[PDB]
Amino acid sequence: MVEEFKVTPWEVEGVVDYDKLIKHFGTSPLTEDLLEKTAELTKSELPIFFRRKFFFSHRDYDLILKDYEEGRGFFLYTGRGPSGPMHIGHIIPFFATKWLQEKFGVNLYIQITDDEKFLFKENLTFDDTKRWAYDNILDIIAVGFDPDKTFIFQNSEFTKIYEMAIPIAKKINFSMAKAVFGFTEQSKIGMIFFPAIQIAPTFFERKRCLIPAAIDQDPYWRLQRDFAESLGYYKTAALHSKFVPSLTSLSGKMSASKPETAIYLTDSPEDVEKKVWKFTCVVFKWLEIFFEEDDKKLKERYYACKNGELTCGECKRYLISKIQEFLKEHQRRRKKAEKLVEKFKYTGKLAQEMWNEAIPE
Amino acid sequence: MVEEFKVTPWEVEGVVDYDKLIKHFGTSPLTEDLLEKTAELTKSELPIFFRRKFFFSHRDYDLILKDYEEGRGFFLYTGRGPSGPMHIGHIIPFFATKWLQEKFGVNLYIQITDDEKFLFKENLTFDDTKRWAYDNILDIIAVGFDPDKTFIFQNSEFTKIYEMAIPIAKKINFSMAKAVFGFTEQSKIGMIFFPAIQIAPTFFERKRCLIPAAIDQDPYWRLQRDFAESLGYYKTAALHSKFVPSLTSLSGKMSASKPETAIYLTDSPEDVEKKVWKFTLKCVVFKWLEIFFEEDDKKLKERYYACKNGELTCGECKRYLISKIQEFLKEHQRRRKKAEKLVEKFKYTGKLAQEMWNEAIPE
Ligand SMILES: Nc1ncnc2c1ncn2[C@@H]1O[C@H](COP(=O)(O)OC(=O)[C@@H](N)Cc2c[nH]c3ccccc23)[C@@H](O)[C@H]1O
Ligand SMILES: Nc1ncnc2c1ncn2[C@@H]1O[C@H](COP(=O)(O)OC(=O)[C@@H](N)Cc2c[nH]c3ccccc23)[C@@H](O)[C@H]1O
């Protein structure tokens, strides 16, 4: 409908209207019955972010469920751009991907775009982008995925994605690249080629693909669906989440560009405290999105704050408690993840199959 | 000065003035001094295409000899785009690279751009280029390179060049790509990226690179030289050859687009006969002998005078040309069959090939 905010795979500016964005991008709203269809098919309760509609939009999700119950299955694909340390917003797609692999028992491909973040950022060198890649793996593997149904790879290392991208790189016209991603005459040739690389993992299997991500990554999936059939694959399915807002603002997105308003997965308990205490509804947004896994306590405390039974200080003390408990658990797992990197990258069942794409010798 | 002919890495149209092309591309002429300088260091006589100045232009070639003389050495790189069968023009760069590897004893990297040819040709599929890749390898191995100092790879297979291309894929902005290669809004994104892939093999070693090829491939190299030092490498050296003309026409070059005027490395003796005999056509007849076929300088000059002065009939000259083409092709096709066994060595098992493939992470 209206134009005053920006949502690209690299920028999110201004107050985001998710209802308009659903039409701007042409994505289907994740209906109430589609959520209940998953609950009855997996025979379990949906996680916090699904039932509270943090994931608001979808593409061919009804097709994914139809494929599963008819026994032809599917596979999961999500990714991460290692431009620096990860925050709470970056990890939610992976938690959604964890639950989906858990309940449906499907393969998972995780793309670490260390090539992208070198190409798209001037400050960063290719060397330190590979550094953050490893650091980011640790956080991702700390979520807990099936060691035999998951493949985590870097584009610079598992360079087979280049060969996997060439088909679509011949399909994607350059005029339409500039149109979808806003490339200009001043973009780098590596920048212009990259969309082929991010689309490539959808062709890991002949089965249909599901991509749990935030709405900002959608432009890639539109182009995929434009040429999927002519390349002999299914039009990729997607589940789109909203954005985790920053502390001070509601007119943007939690970004590492503003470290003061972002809680990193690697943040200390003192860092959490200092960031929340220091300023001044955002407080309950985070609890609704990720941190309070109880609906009754969420509902009761919100109205206890809205009407004024709870003081502001006691209210954000409760936020700190929740995000401190999660970070303590995550950082503990990070240390345990260090000795599982080889499994998810090389040694594991899926990882071994994929790496057996090196010429027989 | 003048541009009423087109020379891009994908098309050559019209009669080509090689003198102006040196100015247009900013290359430097291969001086008579440099030819004799190489003969001293190599301690031998120069090949037909070198001494008869078929290779006419160069870049930093004086710096490639200085490095060898001062004991720090260099390395060779050339390539081939597998769109179909290879003709006689395609193989000359490889013969030059053979001689340079022989006399200088350096490493050789051969890039088979089966990715380029799929992207740039609408009619070709990725499988087409992959199988034409194998076919072309046989012809390239048939030339005879050091089995331990040569690596022949395919961009779709040795996908390591993608990681080798990223650094310069961030340097070369899109405005530059259009200006150098003539890309338009109708180009495919894979086309626009590709120059990074063809430049990448110049970063195989820290030593400086020499590229023996025809002048049409030069746009890639002058773009490599713009960013080589900022990426921590030497700006690549090059040796540029002229084009082998087609049978009938004096404009353009020998191309697979017109198979009837091209001598393919796979052509039978009767194919050569029919192609030469069939058309009325005479500079071309002796151009080929000057640049590739007649290894004797004294015999070459003698028959040129005997032809132009009318002492020998054209029928004798065409018969003389055919016999020399047939001698080469009989010998090449013989070595081509023996080449089928050496493929695994040049691609994987060989000393250099094994070193490069050890970029499959420790597992
Ligand atoms: N503030 C936020 N709130 C909620 N979710 C957010 C927030 N910020 C980011 N996300 C989602 O987190 C994932 C990683 O973001 P990246 O920017 O690294 O995402 C990137 O840099 C990609 N180019 C890397 C990539 C490659 N393949 C993929 C497939 C799916 C998703 C991502 C990828 C993404 O799912 C993103 O949608
Ligand atoms: N009519 C002719 N007369 C004499 N030489 C000719 C003639 N036509 C072509 N050549 C030379 O043959 C080699 C391969 O040609 P391609 O078109 O496959 O060339 C191609 O398609 C490249 N994209 C493949 C490539 C990748 N890296 C390289 C490095 C050097 C040279 C070539 C490459 C080239 O040396 C070319 O200069």
UniProtKB/Swiss-Prot annotation, chain B:
Recorded name of the encoding gene: trpS
Motif ('HIGH' region): 82-90
Organism: Pyrococcus horikoshii (strain ATCC 700860 / DSM 12428 / JCM 9974 / NBRC 100139 / OT-3)
Top-rank lineage group of the source organism: Archaea
Entry GO MF terms: ATP binding; tryptophan-tRNA ligase activity
Chain segments annotated as coiled-coil in the UniProt record: none
Major subcellular location class: cytoplasm
NCBIfam families: PRK12285.1-1 (NF008924), PRK12285.1-4 (NF008927), trpS (TIGR00233)
Chain span(s) of sequence motif 'KMSKS' region: 253-257
SUPFAM superfamilies: Nucleotidylyl transferase (SSF52374)
GO biological process assignments: tryptophanyl-tRNA aminoacylation
Catalytic activity: tRNA(Trp) + L-tryptophan + ATP = L-tryptophyl-tRNA(Trp) + AMP + diphosphate + H(+)
Identification of the protein by name: Tryptophan--tRNA ligase
